[PDB]
Amino acid sequence: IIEFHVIGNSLANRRVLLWLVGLQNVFSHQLPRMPKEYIARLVFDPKHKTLALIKDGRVIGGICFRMFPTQGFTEIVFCAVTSNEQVKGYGTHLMNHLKEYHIKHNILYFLTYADEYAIGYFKKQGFSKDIKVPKSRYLGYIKDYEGATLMECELNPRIPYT
Amino acid sequence: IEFHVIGNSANRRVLLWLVGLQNVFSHQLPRMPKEYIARLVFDPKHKTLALIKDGRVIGGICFRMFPTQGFTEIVFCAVTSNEQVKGYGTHLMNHLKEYHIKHNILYFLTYADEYAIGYFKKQGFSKDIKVPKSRYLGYIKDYEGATLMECELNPRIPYT
Amino acid sequence: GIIEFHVIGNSLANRRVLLWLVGLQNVFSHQLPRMPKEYIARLVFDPKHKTLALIKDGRVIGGICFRMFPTQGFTEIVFCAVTSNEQVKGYGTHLMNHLKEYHIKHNILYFLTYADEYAIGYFKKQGFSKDIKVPKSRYLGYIKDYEGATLMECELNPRIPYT
Amino acid sequence: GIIEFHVIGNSLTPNRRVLLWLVGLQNVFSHQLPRMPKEYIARLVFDPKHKTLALIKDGRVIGGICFRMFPTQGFTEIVFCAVTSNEQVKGYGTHLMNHLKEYHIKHNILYFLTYADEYAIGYFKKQGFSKDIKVPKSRYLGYIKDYEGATLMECELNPRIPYT
Amino acid sequence: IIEFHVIGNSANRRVLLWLVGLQNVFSHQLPRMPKEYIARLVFDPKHKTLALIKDGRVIGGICFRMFPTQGFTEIVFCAVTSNEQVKGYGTHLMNHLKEYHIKHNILYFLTYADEYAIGYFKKQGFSKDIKVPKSRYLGYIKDYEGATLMECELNPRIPYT
Amino acid sequence: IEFHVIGNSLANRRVLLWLVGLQNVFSHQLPRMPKEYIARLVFDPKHKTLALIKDGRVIGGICFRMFPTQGFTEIVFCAVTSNEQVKGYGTHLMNHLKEYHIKHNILYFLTYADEYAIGYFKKQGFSKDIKVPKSRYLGYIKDYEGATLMECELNPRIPYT
Amino acid sequence: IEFHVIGNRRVLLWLVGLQNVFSHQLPRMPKEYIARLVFDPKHKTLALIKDGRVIGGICFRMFPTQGFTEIVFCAVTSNEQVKGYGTHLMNHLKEYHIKHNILYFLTYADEYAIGYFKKQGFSKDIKVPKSRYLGYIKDYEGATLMECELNPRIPYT
Amino acid sequence: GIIEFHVIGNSLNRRVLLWLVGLQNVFSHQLPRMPKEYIARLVFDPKHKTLALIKDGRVIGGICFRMFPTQGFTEIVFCAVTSNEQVKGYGTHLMNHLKEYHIKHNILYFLTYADEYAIGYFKKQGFSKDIKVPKSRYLGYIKDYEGATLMECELNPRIPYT
Amino acid sequence: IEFHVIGNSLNRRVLLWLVGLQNVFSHQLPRMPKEYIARLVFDPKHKTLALIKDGRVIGGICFRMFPTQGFTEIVFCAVTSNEQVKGYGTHLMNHLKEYHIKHNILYFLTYADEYAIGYFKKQGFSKDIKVPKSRYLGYIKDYEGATLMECELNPR
Amino acid sequence: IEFHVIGNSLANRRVLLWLVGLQNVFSHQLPRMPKEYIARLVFDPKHKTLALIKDGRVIGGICFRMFPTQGFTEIVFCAVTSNEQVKGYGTHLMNHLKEYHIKHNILYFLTYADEYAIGYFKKQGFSKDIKVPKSRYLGYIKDYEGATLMECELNPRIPYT
């Protein structure tokens, strides 16, 4: 009983608002030292969207991303599956569903700044430390931080990810 | 500080306050399922007295007025962990009492954990329920293992 | 096959929600086949009554017909039926569970019902009891009394997900 | 007979002669390019941010150039480029490219980029494209679909001469 | 997954791309018909198509034109992509089509079957004996050279689906 | 040259003057039908005419009456001015007419032909063997005794232009 | 001491006070230019209000689609300087930009002021691409273009 | 040498706002011992207007006044020419344009309480210490600043002042 | 003499001024296809500072503002022959520059043919290219044989 | 090759650039008439211009001023670009102009012709003997000291195009 939803704050629906509170809960827990207030402002920012992993009407994971169709890439912001539902293949389905969502919107590059604790998941999902995008195109849009590893994924719009 | 009676219908400042409240309630009552605390805090018939410190939620009381029945359900009470023992729990309850006096609601009802019984007893609540069982049963949510407490309000004396 | 649950009520325009309703009228009146069919029709098509319809591939298979009393704090379960074509498949339970979550989201935590002899087993199965907590002064005159039958009650728990 | 050139494309709202021309173009591009998924060719021809210069004979589509304009960056990407088999070697490809050149001059876009497969390079060479890219990498990377076999080619347009 | 959707024009573009998928499939499996002819009919407003969708992708369909005034429906294009043939999808398709037509009070299918499609329509209940009067289908359904006129009568009391 | 399907709608200074021209050439290539009769049909809201116009002048046309409910179209008047004859204008007029009708799902023409029109209709693909049943056209098309009914069936998959 | 982001009577007077404080504490530039920027409805000013009177402010222009803000004017009026209001002003501006999710500050600043911008965390090493601010911010011989990167992982107030 | 006379004021448009600020800057510089907030509150009072002296789109002088049409007189509050455009006859023309404006608005009396430093300019412009307006007509509407000298100017509608 | 920053937006006083400008640019640059000169002068995002004696056009500068890249393209500059050698060309460039200080910009780039060298030099244009090719490429219209010339601004 | 009667009425993308082109053509084949004058007339509302559009370019035109109240039309400017002359364009322009005026019942053209235009106007049927009374054109057509007044009378049955 698993479905994938691309949601976000428009300002209507309550289930969305509760989903976004669930996503904020999930992200905020897995990522403690980041202020709860800050994760909420990002999840509830309209320019951010979340691909939510739903089981039985219930949020168990998702990816918070920020599209920059002006620049040709999407920033991967938050990326988490709740601890009870891990190691079930959900993190890959989440990423693949985000990749097909993005080729159908003519965006073919993901960019993210990753902890040391996330690098492995992004590596598994096909992300690389060789950034083909020039720095003059993402810097200032994606949140750069000292000590973070910029990683890139190139999407082949000719293969169906889902 | 700032005291606000907020709720759900728009406005994003308020809505981010609700999420703050939900995280505080969910944190201080790990007892309760996160999704349940969210469902109530965002219920329109529920509203919350938010304790704000510099645009930031540090406490609150989620309550549901039943004006037709003549009482209010105290649902959630929390002051954030790093801000307690400053008198905020008492100031929040009092603001709530004066809010209800101005709406002719002079009875609070709450189901309290024994972790919370001490707080409600010192805010004036009692285990001896004057409101008839026929007026509240099936209106307030019964959490078994908790004990029902009631507070009667004096509309003539001032609280803030 | 594809199976769906929707609470189909009635206001004041849709095509098949009505045809779902007459089907519901039929399955209730087919499995409850001694109460006057017109009565079942008037209730099923009453505006303040709703019906949780269990539908698969368009055909109606089951339903629970209920009338919420949110001022009084309870809902009346008037009709419960799965068509004999699809019994013994746990659909009676899936129906009641979807009814339970629907009412939890509407802050109604008590069901009340009058059960005939051939439905008491179903309600015991689903958590109902003969020990009534809702006071008489709050249900009497509201729920259709039908007293050759048993008043049973189910208290819901808002914390748990039923579906 | 009655050779026409029309810059067509999908909108968010709305015409039907255009829709059938878009299906024809999707049929020509797909047939001429059979290992690429038909659904991807359809998704591009029907994307609103993509336009196609349809080559029309007797109202039937016999060729086209599918392109996407990037006015913010100052170039256009040539996506698909085809002429029907039984109408080739009739000089229609050159006429198609020239109307596209004229169309892009009028819109202040004076650079064409394209990732050519090996079977298209000869056509692009004869139409004035080069492997020497004057547009900076910092400008097209990520906007145009790169591919690890294709050959990036560029065409510079003269806005003062008339290409038609 | 498998979905059945009756689509056409009025449209959308999940629908338009589905129609292009349908047109592509009809054209590959019927190299008999010109590609622009198939596109014209698949995109004609008075035509509808029962689209067989798998993974959000078109794999089969039955394009038909309803003649409610004349009391029958014309089966125009009928195809399942090669990878999914011999899976019983052609019969599920026709079944859902018969159900769709029972609920619109159309109980007679007419079709012209080429040499290669006659067997299939036999398996789905069609016959070469046409009880619809020639005065009511001639000029309405399109004749195709050398094909065979075949007809199916529907029973409103069977839910085929 | 231009081919324009015009017709009087129940306005456009130019198209009416064209319609007057077609009325003239119809009446002068058929100089004993009451011009009053030609005028009423040319300007009838349900008759339309494929006008063959050159440099803004009417040189030929086909006046017709479509019966979509009945499945056919009536050819009523068919002519090319006496100067512009013997240059293939009557066939190109007939071919644009067929293209128009195939796009409108009308695949049968019916007409009554006089002395001078039989060979023309034979040229353009017409036949004296009538496939369309008498119940479908009698009373809808304007009958003559002495004239010869002729029929044309259109193939919707070839392009006629 | 009250902080207000502004750009009504009380507000207009407050903006004239800001133009007065800026033009006095920065007598280089034309008061006409200073007024133009102060009263642009797209420039904003974090105003430092004491007893209802303007004693300082920071005038800035957010470019939320480009992910930065230009620091135009920074001034505390002279009889309030050594009290450290300049730092509280900058902390309120940083914190305000995190809430509105903008993390790079850009400013052209006098030699007369660079020392202040360093105590506030600015550097002359410019990580931001030129094709980002070009044509949006206004050049001077501001001795240095200077950048400050903001970290949301920390409340700034 | 493009110079312009404009009567501007606050509605109870923005190059009026910028001209007002320049005028407040002018008066504030000339009167360093008045609070600049007070000069602002007056210049931006709607009941106050200012005859702006403009050159090349830039306020170089002005006269801030308040009309009392119910009382039949106007108060000159502020009066200044920026100090490098002085001694060019601009102070005369500023006051003359103000005279023309007021006779076309049926006001024939200027009143002003003058600095020690301003009396000689007013005298040059026809002001007098002999006040014909009765005290019952201005006292309390204008402020009698201790140490100022009340001065008056009687205008003639038959005279063309510009 | 009036200076007007005009252009086509989506008005006839302006319109005949545009045609006038197009003629002056056409006559002084006499073998550039006038369809091209007109196409730009009437392009809605090209603008022209019209130098207007009487109420008629006696000179002008057609330019094309490119903010995100930090420079404006000068396409056309001409004073008609009667009012040449009074320095109107230099007054024009001064009104252009000052209009550009109040507006977004501090750089001028132009492709100058063999006859335009002198004017730009005296306006301060130089043959050294301190704008990297990474930015004027694809926005200014490259001219083959011409010489790219740059003018750095006076700021205020 | 197309013909359009255009002009400022009280434009669009096409017509304005077309009139700028027309003004350039007129100006360069009258290279010492003041261009401000030619532009003011070309863009004057009561002035119209029959434009010769080879494909999208203007290659020729006739600027005329109708005086329907006075029974004639003033030919103002008349020019074919240097490329396309001695290709017969000047005659077809004039003929399209003649038919346009026939359809508006204006059957007299008056024009003042310089040395380089007399021959052309002779070849178009113009005469030096003016049958329009000087009581009727004086003060309506703009005189031209030294130019030759020339007149053309049109036949309303003649089809010129």
UniProtKB/Swiss-Prot annotation, chain D:
Residues modified to N6-acetyllysine: K51
The protein's PTM annotation reads:
Acetylated at Lys-51, inhibiting the protein acetyltransferase activity.
Q: Which residues form a coiled coil?
A: none
Top-level division of the source organism's lineage: Eukaryota
| Annotated stretches, region: Loop 3 | 141-150
Q: Enumerate the residues binding succinyl-CoA.
A: C81, A82, V83, Q88, V89, K90, G91, Y92, G93, T94, Y119
Q: Where does acetyl-CoA bind?
A: C81, A82, V83, Q88, V89, K90, G91, Y92, G93, T94, Y119
Give every N-acetyltransferase domain span.
7-158
Compartments in which it is found: Nucleus; Chromosome; Cytoplasm, Cytoskeleton, Microtubule organizing center, Centrosome
Tissue-specificity statement: Expressed in all tissues tested.
Q: Where is the active site?
A: E77 (proton donor/acceptor)
Q: Family, per the entry?
A: Belongs to the acetyltransferase family. GCN5 subfamily.
Q: What is known of its domains?
A: Loop3 is required for substrate specificity and adopts different structural conformations in succinyl-CoA-bound and acetyl-CoA-bound forms. Tyr-147 has an important role in the selective binding of succinyl-CoA over acetyl-CoA.
This protein's assembly is summarised as: Homooligomer; may form a tetramer of homodimers. Interacts with EP300, CREBBP and ADA2. Component of the TFTC-HAT complex, at least composed of TAF5L, TAF6L, TAF3, TADA3L, SUPT3H/SPT3, TAF2/TAFII150, TAF4/TAFII135, TAF5/TAFII100, KAT2A/GCN5L2, TAF10 and TRRAP. Component of the STAGA transcription coactivator-HAT complex, at least composed of SUPT3H, KAT2A, SUPT7L, TAF5L, TAF6L, TADA3L, TAD1L, TAF10, TAF12, TRRAP and TAF9. The STAGA core complex is associated with a subcomplex required for histone deubiquitination composed of ATXN7L3, ENY2 and USP22. (Microbial infection) Interacts with and acetylates HIV-1 Tat.
What this chain does, per the record?
A: Protein lysine acyltransferase that can act as a acetyltransferase, glutaryltransferase, succinyltransferase or malonyltransferase, depending on the context. Acts as a histone lysine succinyltransferase: catalyzes succinylation of histone H3 on 'Lys-79' (H3K79succ), with a maximum frequency around the transcription start sites of genes. Succinylation of histones gives a specific tag for epigenetic transcription activation. Association with the 2-oxoglutarate dehydrogenase complex, which provides succinyl-CoA, is required for histone succinylation.
Q: Which named protein is this?
A: Histone acetyltransferase KAT2A
Organism per entry: Homo sapiens
Residue window of the full protein shown: 497 to 662 of 837
UniProtKB/Swiss-Prot annotation, chain G:
Q: What does this protein do?
A: Protein lysine acyltransferase that can act as a acetyltransferase, glutaryltransferase, succinyltransferase or malonyltransferase, depending on the context. Acts as a histone lysine succinyltransferase: catalyzes succinylation of histone H3 on 'Lys-79' (H3K79succ), with a maximum frequency around the transcription start sites of genes. Succinylation of histones gives a specific tag for epigenetic transcription activation. Association with the 2-oxoglutarate dehydrogenase complex, which provides succinyl-CoA, is required for histone succinylation.
Query: So where does succinyl-CoA get bound?
Result: C74, A75, V76, Q81, V82, K83, G84, Y85, G86, T87, Y112
Where does the entry say this protein is expressed, by tissue?
Answer: Expressed in all tissues tested.
**Oligomeric form and interacting partners:** Homooligomer; may form a tetramer of homodimers. Interacts with EP300, CREBBP and ADA2. Component of the TFTC-HAT complex, at least composed of TAF5L, TAF6L, TAF3, TADA3L, SUPT3H/SPT3, TAF2/TAFII150, TAF4/TAFII135, TAF5/TAFII100, KAT2A/GCN5L2, TAF10 and TRRAP. Component of the STAGA transcription coactivator-HAT complex, at least composed of SUPT3H, KAT2A, SUPT7L, TAF5L, TAF6L, TADA3L, TAD1L, TAF10, TAF12, TRRAP and TAF9. The STAGA core complex is associated with a subcomplex required for histone deubiquitination composed of ATXN7L3, ENY2 and USP22.
Ranges where the record places region Loop 3: 134-143
Q: Report what the protein is called.
A: Histone acetyltransferase KAT2A
The entry's family comment says:
Belongs to the acetyltransferase family. GCN5 subfamily.
Upon changing K44Q, the result is: Mimics acetylation; reduced ability to acetylate and inhibit PPARGC1A. Strongly reduced ability to acetylate and inhibit PPARGC1A
Superkingdom: Eukaryota
Per the UniProt entry, the disulfide pairs are none
Posttranslational modification, per the record? Acetylated at Lys-44, inhibiting the protein acetyltransferase activity.
Taxonomic source organism: Homo sapiens
Where, in this chain's numbering, is acetyl-CoA bound? Answer: C74, A75, V76, Q81, V82, K83, G84, Y85, G86, T87, Y112
Domains (record comment): Loop3 is required for substrate specificity and adopts different structural conformations in succinyl-CoA-bound and acetyl-CoA-bound forms. Tyr-140 has an important role in the selective binding of succinyl-CoA over acetyl-CoA.
Residue stretches making up the N-acetyltransferase domain: 5-151
Q: Which residues of the full protein are shown?
A: 499 to 662 of 837
